[PDB]
């Protein structure tokens, strides 16, 4: 996260760290959506152009964390993956269309002050909040600058950007399964996701019921915090019927 | 069915459940109030 700040303790209790077993390295962010289900970006698990192609046993997840590196005694919990589900129409060859994946934990994780699931948006929540200029919040342990790793989880608040401005900012084909967020050059403020933040959540707090909702997944960007560029995010609501199909068919 | 998800989702133990605000959530709320 570029131009953010340290998260507060307990600020993002749905935050999940995706950790590669061998060689050991932080792969991506992710989010907890129930005691058994973790949501991430498909490209964190499958992206052949960068030689990424992970199965359930290649990875583990760490939940409840704040420090990037320190073992957090009686706070963090490690979990194994029983199954990975990548969107069957995820477009890794081109533009990361449908950049979404679910991971089923082998054992349910116990909730705590530091571990708690985020909500997925209903239709009214999505309509009321997915508006240009409305701010969401991005969290992760990714790089602090484009060219530099944080000691603790970082947080930044960023406004959703009008779709034509998103499209003008990039040579990539932007689909209805993506939105972009970030400050414009004239706005002064800065901030972006960066390498290592992929797969983490873009969340918004409903002023109607006080709950945090996951509206986006950190998907891709051209650099980090560049003037005239914006971070792109998976449009979670638009893919929610797939999420619910996976949980209806394979959840318990 | 998963449906709405956890009945308790999105309410943080150390914030909403204690009636405590985090350091920047006000910035989000203010951005959800429209102009004229």
């Amino acid at each position: 996260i570029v131009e953010g700040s340290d998260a507060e303790i307990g600020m993002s209790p749905w935050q999940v760290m995706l950790f590669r077993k061998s060689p050991q390295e932080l792969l991506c962010g992710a989010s907890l959506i129930s005691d058994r289900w973790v949501l991430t970006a498909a490209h964190c698990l499958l992206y052949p152009p960068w030689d990424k192609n992970f199965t359930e046993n290649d990875l583990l997840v760490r939940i409840g964390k704040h420090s990037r590196t320190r073992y957090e005694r009686n706070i963090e919990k490690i979990s194994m993956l029983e199954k990975i589900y990548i969107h069957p129409r995820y477009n890794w060859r081109e533009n990361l269309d449908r950049d979404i994946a679910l991971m089923k934990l082998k054992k349910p994780v116990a909730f705590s002050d530091y571990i708690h699931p985020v909500c997925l948006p209903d239709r009214e929540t999505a309509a009321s909040l997915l508006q240009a200029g409305y701010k969401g919040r991005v969290t992760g342990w990714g790089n602090l600058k484009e060219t530099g790793q944080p000691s603790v989880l970082q947080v930044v608040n960023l406004p959703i950007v009008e779709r034509p401005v998103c499209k003008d900012s990039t040579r990539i084909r932007i689909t209805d399964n993506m939105f972009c967020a970030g400050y414009k050059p004239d706005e002064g403020k800065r901030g972006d996701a960066c390498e290592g933040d992929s797969g983490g959540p873009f969340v918004m707090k409903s002023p109607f019921n006080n709950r945090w909702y996951q509206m986006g997944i950190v998907s891709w960007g051209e650099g980090c915090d560049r003037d005239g560029k914006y971070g792109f995010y998976t449009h979670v609501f638009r893919l929610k019927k797939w999420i619910q199909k996976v949980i209806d068919q394979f959840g318990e | 069915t998963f449906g709405s998800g956890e009945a308790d989702c999105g309410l943080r133990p150390l914030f909403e459940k204690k009636s405590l605000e985090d350091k920047t959530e006000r910035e989000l709320l203010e951005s959800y109030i429209d102009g004229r």
């Binding site: 152009p49 960068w50 129409r89 060859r93 081109e94 533009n95 990361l96 449908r98 239709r123 999505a126 309509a127 997915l130 508006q131 240009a132 200029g133 409305y134 484009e146 959703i160 950007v161 009008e162 779709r163 040579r171 990539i172 084909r173 209805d176 399964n177 993506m178 939105f179 960066c194 390498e195 992929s198 891709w220 960007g221 051209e222 650099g223 980090c224 560049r226 449009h235 609501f237 638009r238 893919l239 929610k240 019927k241 797939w242 | 429209d34 102009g35």
Partner: peptide, 25 residues
């Protein structure tokens, strides 16, 4: 106040690859 993303659902029924863009992440 303008929609940032459409309120509908992805259903069944091409350009530059992301990896070709300098600085892509």
């Amino acid at each position: 106040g303008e929609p940032g993303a459409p309120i509908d659902y992805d259903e069944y029924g091409g350009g530059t690859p992301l990896h070709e863009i300098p600085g892509i992440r």
